[PDB]
Tab-separated table of C-alpha atoms and ligand atoms in Angstrom:
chain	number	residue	atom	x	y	z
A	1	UNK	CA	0.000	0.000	0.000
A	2	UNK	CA	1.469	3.254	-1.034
A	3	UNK	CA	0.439	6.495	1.188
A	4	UNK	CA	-1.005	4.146	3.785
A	5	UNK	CA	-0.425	4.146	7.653
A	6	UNK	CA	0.400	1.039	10.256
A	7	UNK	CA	-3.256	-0.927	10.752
A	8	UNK	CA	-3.770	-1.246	14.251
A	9	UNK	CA	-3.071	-4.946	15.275
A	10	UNK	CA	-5.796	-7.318	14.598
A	11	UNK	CA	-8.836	-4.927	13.571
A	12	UNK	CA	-9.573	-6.737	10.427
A	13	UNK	CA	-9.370	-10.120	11.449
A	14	UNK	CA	-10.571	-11.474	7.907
A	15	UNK	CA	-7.328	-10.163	6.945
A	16	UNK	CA	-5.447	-13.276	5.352
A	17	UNK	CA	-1.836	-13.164	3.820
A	18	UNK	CA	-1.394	-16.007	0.968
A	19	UNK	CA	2.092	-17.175	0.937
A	20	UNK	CA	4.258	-18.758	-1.134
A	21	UNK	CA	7.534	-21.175	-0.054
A	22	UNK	CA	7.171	-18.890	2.811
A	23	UNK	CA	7.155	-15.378	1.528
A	24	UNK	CA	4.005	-12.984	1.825
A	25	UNK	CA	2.372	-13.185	-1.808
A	26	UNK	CA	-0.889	-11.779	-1.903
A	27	UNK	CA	-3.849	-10.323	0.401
A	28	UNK	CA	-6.586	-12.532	0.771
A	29	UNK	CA	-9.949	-12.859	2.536
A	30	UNK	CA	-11.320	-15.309	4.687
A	31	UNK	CA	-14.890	-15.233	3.100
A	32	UNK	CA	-15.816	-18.635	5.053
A	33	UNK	CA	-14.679	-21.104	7.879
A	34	UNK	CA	-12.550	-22.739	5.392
A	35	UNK	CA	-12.238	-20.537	2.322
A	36	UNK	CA	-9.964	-17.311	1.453
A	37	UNK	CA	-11.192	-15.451	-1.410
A	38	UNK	CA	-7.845	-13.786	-3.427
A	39	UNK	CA	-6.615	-12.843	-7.224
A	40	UNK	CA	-6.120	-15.336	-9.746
A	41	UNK	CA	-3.155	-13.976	-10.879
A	42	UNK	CA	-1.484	-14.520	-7.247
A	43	UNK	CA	-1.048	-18.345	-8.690
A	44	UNK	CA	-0.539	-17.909	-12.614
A	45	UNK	CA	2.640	-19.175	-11.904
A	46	UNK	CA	3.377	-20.449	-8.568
A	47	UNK	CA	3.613	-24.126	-10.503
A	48	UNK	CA	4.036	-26.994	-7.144
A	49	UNK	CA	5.495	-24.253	-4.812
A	50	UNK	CA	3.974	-24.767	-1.513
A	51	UNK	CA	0.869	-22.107	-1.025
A	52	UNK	CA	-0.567	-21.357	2.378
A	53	UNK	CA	-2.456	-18.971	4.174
A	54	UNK	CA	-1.265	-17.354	7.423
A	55	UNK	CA	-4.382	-15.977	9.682
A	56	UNK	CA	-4.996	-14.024	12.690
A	57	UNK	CA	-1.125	-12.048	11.815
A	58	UNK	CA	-0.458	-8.490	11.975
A	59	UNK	CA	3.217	-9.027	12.311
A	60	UNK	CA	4.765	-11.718	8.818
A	61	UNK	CA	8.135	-11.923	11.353
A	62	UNK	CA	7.121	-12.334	14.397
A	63	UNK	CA	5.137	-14.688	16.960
A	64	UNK	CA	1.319	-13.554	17.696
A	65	UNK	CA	-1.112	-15.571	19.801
A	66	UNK	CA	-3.990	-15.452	17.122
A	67	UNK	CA	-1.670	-15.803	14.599
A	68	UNK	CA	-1.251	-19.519	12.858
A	69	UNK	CA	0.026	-20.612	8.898
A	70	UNK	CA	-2.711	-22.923	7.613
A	71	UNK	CA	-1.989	-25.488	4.555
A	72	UNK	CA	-3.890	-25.554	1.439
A	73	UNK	CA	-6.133	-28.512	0.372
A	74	UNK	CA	-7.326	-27.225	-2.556
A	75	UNK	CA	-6.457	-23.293	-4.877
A	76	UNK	CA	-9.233	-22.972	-7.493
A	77	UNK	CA	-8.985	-20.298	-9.682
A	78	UNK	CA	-11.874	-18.551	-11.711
A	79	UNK	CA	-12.321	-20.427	-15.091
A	80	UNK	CA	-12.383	-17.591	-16.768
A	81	UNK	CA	-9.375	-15.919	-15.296
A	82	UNK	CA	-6.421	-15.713	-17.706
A	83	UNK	CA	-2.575	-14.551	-17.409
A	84	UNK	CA	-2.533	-11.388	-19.557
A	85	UNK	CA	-6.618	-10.052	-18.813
A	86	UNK	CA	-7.718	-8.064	-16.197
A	87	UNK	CA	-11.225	-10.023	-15.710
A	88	UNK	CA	-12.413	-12.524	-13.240
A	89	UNK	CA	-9.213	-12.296	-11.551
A	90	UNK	CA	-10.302	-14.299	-8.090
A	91	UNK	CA	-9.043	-17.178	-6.723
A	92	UNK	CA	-10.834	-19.509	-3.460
A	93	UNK	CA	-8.212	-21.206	-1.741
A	94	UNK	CA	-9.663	-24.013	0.557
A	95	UNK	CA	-8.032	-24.511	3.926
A	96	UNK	CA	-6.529	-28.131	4.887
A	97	UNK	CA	-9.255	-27.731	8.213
A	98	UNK	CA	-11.599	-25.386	9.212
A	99	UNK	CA	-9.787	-21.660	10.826
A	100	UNK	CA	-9.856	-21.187	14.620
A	101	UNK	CA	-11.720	-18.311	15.096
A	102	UNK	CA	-11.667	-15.834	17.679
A	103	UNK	CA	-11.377	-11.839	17.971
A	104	UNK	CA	-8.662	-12.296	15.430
A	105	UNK	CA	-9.714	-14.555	12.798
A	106	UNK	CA	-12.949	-14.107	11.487
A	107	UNK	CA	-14.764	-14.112	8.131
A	108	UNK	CA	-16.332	-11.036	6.876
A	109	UNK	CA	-19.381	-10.619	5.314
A	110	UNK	CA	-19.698	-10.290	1.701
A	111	UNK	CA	-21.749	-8.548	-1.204
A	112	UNK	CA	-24.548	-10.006	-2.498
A	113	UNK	CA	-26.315	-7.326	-3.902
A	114	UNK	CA	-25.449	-6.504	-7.543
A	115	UNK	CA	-25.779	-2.816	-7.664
A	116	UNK	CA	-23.162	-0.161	-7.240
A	117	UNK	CA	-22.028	1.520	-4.188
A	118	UNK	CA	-22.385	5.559	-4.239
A	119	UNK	CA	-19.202	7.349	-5.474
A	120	UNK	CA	-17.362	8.506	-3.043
A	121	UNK	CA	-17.751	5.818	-0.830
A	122	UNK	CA	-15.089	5.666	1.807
A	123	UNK	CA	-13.791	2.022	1.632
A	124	UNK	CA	-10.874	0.394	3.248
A	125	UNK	CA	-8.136	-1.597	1.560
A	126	UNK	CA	-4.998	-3.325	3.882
A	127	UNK	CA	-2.247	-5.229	2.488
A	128	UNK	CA	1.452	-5.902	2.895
A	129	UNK	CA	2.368	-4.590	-0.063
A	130	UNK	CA	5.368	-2.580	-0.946
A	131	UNK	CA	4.785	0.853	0.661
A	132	UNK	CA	7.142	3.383	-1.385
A	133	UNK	CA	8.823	3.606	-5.256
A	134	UNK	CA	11.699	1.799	-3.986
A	135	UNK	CA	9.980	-1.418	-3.079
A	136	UNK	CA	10.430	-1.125	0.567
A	137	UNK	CA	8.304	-4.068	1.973
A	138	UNK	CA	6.223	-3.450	5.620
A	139	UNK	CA	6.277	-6.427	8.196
A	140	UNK	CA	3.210	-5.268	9.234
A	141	UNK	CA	-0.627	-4.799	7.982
A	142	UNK	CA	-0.677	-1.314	6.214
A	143	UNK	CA	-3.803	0.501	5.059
A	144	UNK	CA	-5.887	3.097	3.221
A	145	UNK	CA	-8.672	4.428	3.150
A	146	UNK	CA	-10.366	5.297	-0.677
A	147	UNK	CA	-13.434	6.747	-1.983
A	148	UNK	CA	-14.625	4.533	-4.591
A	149	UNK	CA	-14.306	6.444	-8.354
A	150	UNK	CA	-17.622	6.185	-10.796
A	151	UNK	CA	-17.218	3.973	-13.460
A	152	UNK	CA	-17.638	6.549	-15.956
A	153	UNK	CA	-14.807	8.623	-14.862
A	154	UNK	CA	-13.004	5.494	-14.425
A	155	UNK	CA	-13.350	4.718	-17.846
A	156	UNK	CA	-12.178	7.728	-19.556
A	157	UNK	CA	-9.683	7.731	-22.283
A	158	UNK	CA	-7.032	9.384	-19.812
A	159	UNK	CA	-8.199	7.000	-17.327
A	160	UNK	CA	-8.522	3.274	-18.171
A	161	UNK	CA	-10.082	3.551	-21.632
A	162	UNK	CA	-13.239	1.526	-21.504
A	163	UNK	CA	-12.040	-1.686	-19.580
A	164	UNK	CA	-13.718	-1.174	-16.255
A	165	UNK	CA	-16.715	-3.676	-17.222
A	166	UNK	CA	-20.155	-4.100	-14.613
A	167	UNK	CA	-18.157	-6.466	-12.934
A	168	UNK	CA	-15.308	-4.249	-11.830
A	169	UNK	CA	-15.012	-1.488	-9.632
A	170	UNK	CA	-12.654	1.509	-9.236
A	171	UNK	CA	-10.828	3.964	-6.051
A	172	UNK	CA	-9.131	7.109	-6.473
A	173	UNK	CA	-5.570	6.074	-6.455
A	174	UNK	CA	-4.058	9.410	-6.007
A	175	UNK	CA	-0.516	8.770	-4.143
A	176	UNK	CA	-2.762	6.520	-2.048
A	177	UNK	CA	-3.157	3.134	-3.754
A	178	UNK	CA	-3.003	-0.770	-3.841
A	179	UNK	CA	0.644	-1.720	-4.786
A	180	UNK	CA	2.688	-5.150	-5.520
A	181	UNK	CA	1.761	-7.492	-3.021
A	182	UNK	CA	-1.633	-6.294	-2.258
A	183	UNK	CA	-3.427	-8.351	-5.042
A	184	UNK	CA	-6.172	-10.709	-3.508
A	185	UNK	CA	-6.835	-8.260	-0.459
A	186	UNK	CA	-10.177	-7.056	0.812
A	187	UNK	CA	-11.884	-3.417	-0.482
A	188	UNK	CA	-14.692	-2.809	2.338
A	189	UNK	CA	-17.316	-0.950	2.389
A	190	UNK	CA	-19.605	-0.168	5.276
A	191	UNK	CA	-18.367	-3.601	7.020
A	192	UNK	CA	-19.084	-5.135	3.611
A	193	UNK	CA	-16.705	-7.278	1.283
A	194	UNK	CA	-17.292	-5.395	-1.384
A	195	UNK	CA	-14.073	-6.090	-3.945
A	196	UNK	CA	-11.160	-7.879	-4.039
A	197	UNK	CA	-7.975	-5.758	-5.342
A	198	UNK	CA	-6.509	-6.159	-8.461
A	199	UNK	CA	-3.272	-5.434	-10.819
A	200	UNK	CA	-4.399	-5.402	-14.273
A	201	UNK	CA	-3.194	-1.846	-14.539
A	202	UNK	CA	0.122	-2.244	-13.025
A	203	UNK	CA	1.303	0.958	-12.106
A	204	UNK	CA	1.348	2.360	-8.587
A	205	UNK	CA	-0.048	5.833	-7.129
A	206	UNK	CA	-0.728	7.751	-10.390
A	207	UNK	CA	-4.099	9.527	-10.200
A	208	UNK	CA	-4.715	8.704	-13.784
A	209	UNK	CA	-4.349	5.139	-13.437
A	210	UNK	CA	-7.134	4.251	-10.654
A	211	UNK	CA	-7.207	1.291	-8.129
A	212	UNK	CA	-9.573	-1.741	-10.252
A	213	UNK	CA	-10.935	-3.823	-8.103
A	214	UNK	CA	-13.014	-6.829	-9.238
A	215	UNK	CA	-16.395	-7.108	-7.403
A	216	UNK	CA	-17.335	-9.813	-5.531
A	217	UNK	CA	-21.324	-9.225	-6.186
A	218	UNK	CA	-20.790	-10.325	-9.478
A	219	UNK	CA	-19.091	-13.425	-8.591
A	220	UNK	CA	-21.871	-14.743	-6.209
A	221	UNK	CA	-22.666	-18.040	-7.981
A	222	UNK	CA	-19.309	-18.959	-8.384
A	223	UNK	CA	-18.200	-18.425	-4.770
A	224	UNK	CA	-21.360	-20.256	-3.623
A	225	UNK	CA	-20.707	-22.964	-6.355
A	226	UNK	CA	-16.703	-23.622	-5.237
A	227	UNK	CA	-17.892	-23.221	-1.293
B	301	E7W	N1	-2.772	-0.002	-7.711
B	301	E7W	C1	-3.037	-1.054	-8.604
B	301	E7W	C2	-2.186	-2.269	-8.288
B	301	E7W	C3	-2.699	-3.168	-7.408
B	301	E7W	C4	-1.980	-4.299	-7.178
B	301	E7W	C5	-0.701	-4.474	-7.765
B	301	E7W	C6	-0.103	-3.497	-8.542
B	301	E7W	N2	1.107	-3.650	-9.116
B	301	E7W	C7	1.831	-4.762	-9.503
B	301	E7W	N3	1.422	-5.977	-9.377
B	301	E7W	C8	2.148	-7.080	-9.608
B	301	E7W	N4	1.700	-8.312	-9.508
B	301	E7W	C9	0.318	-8.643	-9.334
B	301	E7W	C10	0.010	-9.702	-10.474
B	301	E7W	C11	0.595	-11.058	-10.324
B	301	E7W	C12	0.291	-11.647	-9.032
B	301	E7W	C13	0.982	-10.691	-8.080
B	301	E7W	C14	0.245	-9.352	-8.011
B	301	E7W	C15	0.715	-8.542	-6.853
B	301	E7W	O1	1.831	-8.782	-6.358
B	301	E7W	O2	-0.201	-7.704	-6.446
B	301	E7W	N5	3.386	-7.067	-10.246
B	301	E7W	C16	3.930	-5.867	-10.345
B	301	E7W	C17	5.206	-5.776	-11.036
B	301	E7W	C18	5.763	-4.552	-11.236
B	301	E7W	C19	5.071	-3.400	-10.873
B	301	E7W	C20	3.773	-3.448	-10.269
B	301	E7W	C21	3.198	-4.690	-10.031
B	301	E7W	C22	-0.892	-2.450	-8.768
């Protein structure tokens, strides 16, 4: 997260990080008991590196009561997810066993209802992403807090040029953005899942290049069907 500030411990205990061979990854979401919702793209190409989810952290280094690495039975991507497009980019990852939950570790609530959120909407996105041009990485939860851009606007030519479809969202990304490493992680709304970021446009912090974030309304069959 670029132009974020230090989470305070624990406060978003749906918060998941998806790892790979032991390094933070992605953000992800635990949507269910045993389910994290993420990006697609997080896995493109992890190939048979071992993929797990650590819960319940706020610290990646160090040792937290709450917090506990969890295995991966099962990563299924969207079907319709490709390397190289920007669309249906969400992944469920299904936990070996069921999360402990507690204050800590909790899933959140999702959207069900297809219809857009008013513009402006203040909405909060955490990751631990790479916080600054240099690639500085945090060990602990950043976040930001975004009011969500109209489609329209988000759309422009000098914006993202038609390619925010229904099914994506956008947030101002004005030196305050998602960054590298925050793919897969929760945009909420009112207490709401209400998208999960994404990278399609790659670049970092420019106010002509707005946050994309894929909405989870749109996907409700498909999480139901994979859950
Ligand atoms: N603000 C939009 C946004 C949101 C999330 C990520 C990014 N940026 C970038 N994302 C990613 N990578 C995505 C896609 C592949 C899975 C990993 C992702 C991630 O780490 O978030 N690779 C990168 C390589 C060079 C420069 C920037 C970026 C940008």
């Amino acid at each position: 997260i670029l132009g974020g500030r230090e989470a305070e411990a624990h406060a978003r205990p749906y918060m998941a990080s998806v790892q790979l061979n032991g390094a933070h990854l992605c953000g992800g979401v635990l949507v269910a008991e045993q389910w994290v919702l993420s990006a697609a793209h997080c896995l493109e190409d992890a190939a048979d590196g071992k993929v797990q989810v650590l819960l319940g952290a706020h610290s990646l280094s160090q040792p937290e009561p709450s917090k506990r690495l969890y295995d991966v039975l099962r990563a299924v991507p969207h079907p319709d997810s490709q390397p190289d497009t920007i669309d249906h980019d969400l992944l469920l990852l299904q936990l070996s066993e069921k999360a402990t939950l507690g204050p800590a570790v909790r899933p959140l609530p999702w959207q069900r209802v297809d219809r857009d959120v008013a513009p402006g909407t203040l909405c909060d996105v955490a990751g631990w992403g790479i916080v600054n041009h240099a690639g500085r990485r945090p060990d602990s939860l950043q976040h930001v807090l975004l009011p969500v851009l109209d489609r329209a606007t988000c759309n422009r030519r000098t914006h993202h040029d038609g390619a925010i479809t229904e099914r994506l969202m956008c947030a101002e990304s004005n030196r305050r953005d998602s960054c590298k490493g925050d793919s897969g992680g929760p945009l909420v709304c009112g207490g709401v899942l209400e998208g999960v970021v994404t990278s399609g446009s790659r670049v970092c912090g420019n106010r002509k290049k707005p946050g994309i974030y894929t909405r989870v309304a749109s996907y409700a069959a498909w999480i139901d069907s994979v859950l």
